[PDB]
Amino acid sequence: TETYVLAESPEFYQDNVTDYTGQISSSDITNIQAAIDDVKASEQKVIFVVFLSSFDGVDPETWTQQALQANGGGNVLIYALAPEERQYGIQGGTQWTDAELDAANNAAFQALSQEDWAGSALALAESVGSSSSSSSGSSSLEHHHHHH
Protein backbone atom coordinates (compact mmCIF):
# COMPACT_ATOMS: atom_id res chain seq x y z
CA THR A 1 0.00 0.00 0.00
CA GLU A 2 2.98 2.31 -0.71
CA THR A 3 1.08 4.55 -3.20
CA TYR A 4 0.29 8.28 -2.79
CA VAL A 5 -3.00 10.14 -2.15
CA LEU A 6 -5.12 11.16 -5.17
CA ALA A 7 -6.08 14.88 -5.11
CA GLU A 8 -7.18 16.76 -1.93
CA SER A 9 -3.70 18.37 -1.77
CA PRO A 10 -2.99 21.23 0.73
CA GLU A 11 -4.14 24.44 -1.03
CA PHE A 12 -2.48 26.52 1.72
CA TYR A 13 1.18 27.66 1.91
CA GLN A 14 1.15 30.31 -0.86
CA ASP A 15 4.94 30.69 -0.63
CA ASN A 16 7.86 29.20 1.34
CA VAL A 17 10.48 31.64 -0.01
CA THR A 18 10.51 35.42 0.64
CA ASP A 19 13.27 37.86 -0.44
CA TYR A 20 14.19 41.43 0.57
CA THR A 21 17.22 41.47 -1.76
CA GLY A 22 15.88 41.07 -5.31
CA GLN A 23 19.20 39.31 -6.07
CA ILE A 24 17.71 35.80 -6.45
CA SER A 25 16.37 34.71 -9.87
CA SER A 26 12.59 34.09 -9.76
CA SER A 27 12.97 30.68 -11.48
CA ASP A 28 15.51 29.57 -8.83
CA ILE A 29 13.08 30.78 -6.13
CA THR A 30 10.55 28.36 -7.66
CA ASN A 31 13.24 25.62 -7.63
CA ILE A 32 13.84 26.17 -3.89
CA GLN A 33 10.05 26.13 -3.38
CA ALA A 34 9.79 22.78 -5.24
CA ALA A 35 12.54 21.25 -3.05
CA ILE A 36 10.73 22.51 0.08
CA ASP A 37 7.36 21.09 -1.08
CA ASP A 38 8.94 17.62 -1.40
CA VAL A 39 9.71 17.85 2.34
CA LYS A 40 6.22 19.34 2.95
CA ALA A 41 4.56 16.43 1.07
CA SER A 42 6.65 13.47 2.38
CA GLU A 43 8.01 14.52 5.80
CA GLN A 44 5.10 16.88 6.70
CA LYS A 45 7.86 19.45 7.40
CA VAL A 46 7.33 23.06 6.24
CA ILE A 47 10.55 25.02 5.54
CA PHE A 48 10.69 28.85 5.22
CA VAL A 49 13.52 30.68 3.42
CA VAL A 50 13.89 34.45 3.95
CA PHE A 51 16.60 36.36 2.01
CA LEU A 52 17.32 39.44 4.17
CA SER A 53 19.54 42.48 3.46
CA SER A 54 20.99 42.28 6.97
CA PHE A 55 19.96 41.46 10.57
CA ASP A 56 20.15 45.11 11.78
CA GLY A 57 20.54 44.33 15.50
CA VAL A 58 18.50 41.16 16.07
CA ASP A 59 21.21 38.57 15.31
CA PRO A 60 20.64 35.65 12.83
CA GLU A 61 19.83 32.73 15.21
CA THR A 62 17.80 35.06 17.47
CA TRP A 63 15.82 36.43 14.49
CA THR A 64 14.89 32.95 13.20
CA GLN A 65 13.88 31.72 16.63
CA GLN A 66 11.60 34.76 17.20
CA ALA A 67 10.02 34.32 13.74
CA LEU A 68 9.52 30.64 14.65
CA GLN A 69 7.82 31.66 17.94
CA ALA A 70 5.38 34.02 16.14
CA ASN A 71 4.72 31.20 13.63
CA GLY A 72 4.18 28.67 16.43
CA GLY A 73 6.72 26.44 14.69
CA GLY A 74 5.37 22.91 14.95
CA ASN A 75 6.66 21.46 11.65
CA VAL A 76 8.09 24.85 10.59
CA LEU A 77 11.77 25.69 9.89
CA ILE A 78 12.87 29.36 9.65
CA TYR A 79 15.98 30.02 7.52
CA ALA A 80 17.26 33.63 7.48
CA LEU A 81 20.11 34.58 5.11
CA ALA A 82 21.92 37.94 4.74
CA PRO A 83 23.99 37.73 1.48
CA GLU A 84 25.26 41.32 1.92
CA GLU A 85 27.01 40.31 5.18
CA ARG A 86 27.61 36.59 4.43
CA GLN A 87 25.73 35.67 7.67
CA TYR A 88 22.71 33.39 8.28
CA GLY A 89 20.55 31.55 10.86
CA ILE A 90 18.60 28.25 10.95
CA GLN A 91 15.91 27.18 13.49
CA GLY A 92 13.25 24.44 13.30
CA GLY A 93 10.07 23.64 15.23
CA THR A 94 9.15 20.83 17.67
CA GLN A 95 8.84 18.31 14.79
CA TRP A 96 12.53 18.87 13.89
CA THR A 97 15.55 17.24 15.61
CA ASP A 98 18.85 18.94 16.56
CA ALA A 99 20.47 16.59 14.01
CA GLU A 100 18.11 17.71 11.20
CA LEU A 101 18.83 21.38 11.99
CA ASP A 102 22.60 20.75 12.01
CA ALA A 103 22.52 18.79 8.70
CA ALA A 104 20.48 21.66 7.21
CA ASN A 105 23.08 24.11 8.59
CA ASN A 106 25.96 22.15 6.99
CA ALA A 107 23.93 21.74 3.76
CA ALA A 108 23.31 25.49 3.36
CA PHE A 109 26.85 26.43 4.52
CA GLN A 110 28.41 24.47 1.61
CA ALA A 111 26.68 26.73 -0.94
CA LEU A 112 27.17 29.84 1.26
CA SER A 113 31.00 29.55 1.17
CA GLN A 114 30.60 29.40 -2.61
CA GLU A 115 28.30 32.47 -2.27
CA ASP A 116 25.54 30.60 -4.12
CA TRP A 117 22.86 32.18 -1.89
CA ALA A 118 19.84 30.53 -3.57
CA GLY A 119 21.58 27.12 -3.59
CA SER A 120 21.97 27.17 0.21
CA ALA A 121 18.18 27.17 0.68
CA LEU A 122 17.73 24.52 -2.04
CA ALA A 123 20.42 22.27 -0.47
CA LEU A 124 18.88 22.84 2.98
CA ALA A 125 15.57 21.44 1.67
CA GLU A 126 17.26 18.59 -0.27
CA SER A 127 19.08 17.48 2.93
CA VAL A 128 15.61 16.64 4.32
CA GLY A 129 13.87 15.78 1.03
CA SER A 130 16.25 12.82 0.55
CA SER A 131 14.58 11.33 3.68
CA SER A 132 11.43 10.69 1.57
CA SER A 133 11.02 6.88 1.76
CA SER A 134 8.18 4.41 0.97
CA SER A 135 6.89 4.94 4.55
CA SER A 136 3.17 5.42 3.75
CA GLY A 137 0.48 5.70 6.45
CA SER A 138 -3.11 4.41 6.54
CA SER A 139 -4.69 7.65 5.22
CA SER A 140 -7.30 8.16 2.46
CA LEU A 141 -9.57 11.12 1.51
CA GLU A 142 -12.78 11.50 -0.55
CA HIS A 143 -15.51 14.15 -0.95
CA HIS A 144 -18.47 11.72 -1.05
CA HIS A 145 -20.97 13.64 -3.22
CA HIS A 146 -24.47 14.38 -1.87
CA HIS A 147 -27.32 12.95 -3.99
CA HIS A 148 -30.96 13.14 -2.80
Q: Which CATH number fits domain 1-148: 3.30.530.20, 3.40.50.300, 3.40.50.280, 3.10.310.50?
A: 3.10.310.50
Contact in structure between 124 and 100 (CB atoms under 8 Å) = no
Distance (Å, whole) CA 107 – CA 121: 8
Backbone angles phi, psi at 46, to 5 degrees: -105, 110
Strand partners, 51: 19, 81
Indicate the helix (H) or strand (E) that contains 17. strand 17-19
Distance (Å, whole) CA 27 – CA 103: 25
Burial of 103 (0-12, 13-18, 19+ CB in 10 A): middle
Under DSSP, the state recorded for 56 is T
Nearest to 88 by CA among 8, 135, 2, 21: 21
